[PDB]
Symmetry: D2
Subunit: 251 residues, 4 copies
């Protein structure tokens, strides 16, 4: 309770799985929240499932859409006052090796996973700096920002980019006394409805050779590290990677 009092957060891809848990816990801690998704049918229901409009709203947006990011910030500020917190969570995967990645797949993934995080980080800094908000940008950056996977070539590119770009932004913010921190969160495999719909997926990810705990995590595992990073508890953490992966990258 109260760990995010007065905060105003945008969470991209906040309508499902990890994003929805982050929104849920954010609201529970006192934050006002705008969640996004490219699809309105999902977002409208999702917000209501978490709370009332005074707590949480939906804004339809594809994070790859530059001009829409401005509209998104404006809508959030209209609803809740100046934004203090941005979680760049929206992402997609292509299940291809580097060898087998089409250029169209490449461009499509980089638009969401890399351009979208860039657009959101850049705008966030511009909108949140110098306001005494204890502003925090949390970029979702995966175990796949640390290690490769033979069948996630473009994904790996996107996640390594986010990992180090976030450091750049953290440093400039720190050096300029912007009162904006930038950090990355690195989930291992997390159980969601989508993983549940992929036959064999959770079992494959739970083999000790993949996740040493022998099971995968749950959305709240990612929500809790996000609360810490959005809160003023983490006011001396910037430019750092926070990994919650059941041991996946420790071996």
């Amino acid at each position: 309770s109260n760990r995010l009092d007065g905060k105003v957060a945008i969470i991209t891809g906040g309508t499902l799985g990890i994003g929805l848990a982050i929104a849920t816990k954010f609201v529970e801690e006192g934050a006002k929240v705008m969640i996004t998704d490219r699809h309105s049918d999902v977002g409208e229901k999702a917000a209501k499932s978490v709370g009332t409009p005074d707590q949480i709203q939906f804004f339809q947006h594809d994070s790859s859409d530059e001009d829409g990011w401005t509209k998104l910030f404006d809508a959030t500020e209209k609803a809740f006052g100046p934004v203090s917190t941005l979680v760049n969570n929206a992402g997609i995967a292509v299940n291809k090796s580097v060898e087998e990645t089409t250029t169209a797949e490449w461009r499509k993934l980089l638009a969401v996973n890399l351009d979208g995080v860039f657009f959101g980080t850049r705008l966030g800094i511009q909108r949140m700096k110098n306001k005494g908000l204890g502003a925090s940008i949390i970029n979702m950056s995966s175990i796949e920002g640390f290690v490769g996977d033979p069948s996630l070539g473009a994904y790996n590119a996107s996640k390594g980019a986010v990992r180090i770009m976030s450091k750049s932004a953290a440093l400039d913010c720190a050096l300029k006394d912007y009162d904006v921190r930038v950090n990355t969160v690195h989930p291992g495999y997390i159980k969601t409805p989508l993983v549940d719909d992929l036959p064999g997926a959770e079992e494959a990810m739970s083999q000790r050779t993949k996740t040493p705990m022998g099971h995968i995590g749950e959305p709240n595992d990612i929500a809790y590290i996000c609360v810490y990073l959005a809160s003023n508890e983490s006011k001396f953490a910037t430019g750092s990677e926070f990994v919650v992966d059941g041991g996946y990258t420790a071996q």
Copy 2:
């Protein structure tokens, strides 16, 4: 509030600075706490400053003392019930290059910073495994576990050792279903009375070439990441490094 309900923690070097803040916040979150220090004059006062004996006690112990670690666990369990949480925080520094480190300095530092963390981790696993406690071992492992410093040669050895030994322990615990997690915390420079007593130290550490935020942190910065790691909030985090350094290692 309540984030550590039912937990029983040992914090080595819990009587001053970072250790004392960790103890303070632990108590505030519902944990029972045993703090240690080689010196009784400090520890007795420190416990009382935080809370009552039903919340927090002192046990005199040098973390380099193998046999005393057993006594410590036994005393904690006597006071509060089975231990769920160990923060290996006690440490010393020698201000020498590798070139200029005496063998006596070398052995003395490794006894506290490395043997002591080993003794505590080993015993913790043995005492906490298979009890359904949501057991967590948090090993203090420094920015100096990631980068070198020309005048911290033995310290760097100790902190790199702790960093990777903790991974080993995390993995074995995960693979064996012990219900024990092991992670490391990596503070940058933190303001304490001891730093305050070193003329010029805080200013030197606050230069942008050292800490990009332009200032050093405070004990509570380390306390809050420890709360997260001791709590069940972090139940899928094991084998990972959590850095709170004001940007120091990001550049």
Copy 3:
């Protein structure tokens, strides 16, 4: 002598500085070399400065040009036989923070530094796999693939991407028994004519707070690690980062 016998290498941006030294040493070790650059006036002279057409040729190409990559491989194979070795060295920098990066700057840098390395890596794997060449792809990936710099936001994104994408490609190649290795090289600051033309640059980069050796490196420093990685000497190295930075990332 003879360390690259029978090898056939493409080096992008091989006409100046690091790329030219890599080409020079490659030729000296027995490799046939095709160097590229967007500008013909530079490339023609550069090749001749190193050796004869039977040793080294120029092919005009912007690494951001997908279709030209095919033409490049075809020309190299025509000149020298099947390609065994690719050094993705061409790159540009934008001297902007994330905050201050225009979208046009962003797209332009990612086209050369990220898309171009992707196009070259993908094609290289397709053309070099399963031929018994001891094939090696060496991706230039910078100190800026490890740490951030406040004024290199897009560059940092590109270099982090290359760093982890290269791991993906290495893994798939290894798992499929392609006889292709993929590794990254991470230069610190290196003295070239371009650095010489930037007043104050070498001095700034040589401050101990930047490069602990107190001076910057020279093109041959990067050439020699490339020889090792192109040669069969490195036949068990794949998926790894090789840093030659005068200590820059060690502190």
Copy 4:
């Protein structure tokens, strides 16, 4: 040929496997070499197998023996002139989890793998600094200096320590203009007679979940990266980790 002309190297544990290959290639490149081992029966034969006394000699020494390190340097200098190159290669393993490591096992491993590297690094700096030798200290620091293994607890401690202590030493040497570089080499699994004598070991290490290349390496794989690091080719590399692991740490 000639890549180590004029160099004078000590290689600890130079009589078998990786150490012997490093000695062999060193001699082949023009270096004079003193190899060590605790056992004389092995060392005497080993030297002769590589070359003549004017090229390579044996000195009986346990790297855990502080006072013997001085004797070792003195003997080398007597034979070949001032030492330019030290490869701290001697090491042992205990096949125990942290939980199950006895204190005697702990102390024994740390004596060889950590104290021994410290003694050798410290003395090397003192003996090699300020002599214009292009001095290089290469510390063997394992894949187990990057990731944990549940059954290599003390080993992991030792290898993480070496990894970061080497950075400290590199930095001090660089900052003081000592003309001594310090770097670490990180082998994955390598085929030797000892591995051959462990039934099932090579097959277990060659599973794609362990080594993605599907096979383990050979002693020369480690020799070649050592040649590069001992040579002046690497004169701008210090404080860095060089990994040759068949992909083991890339996934």
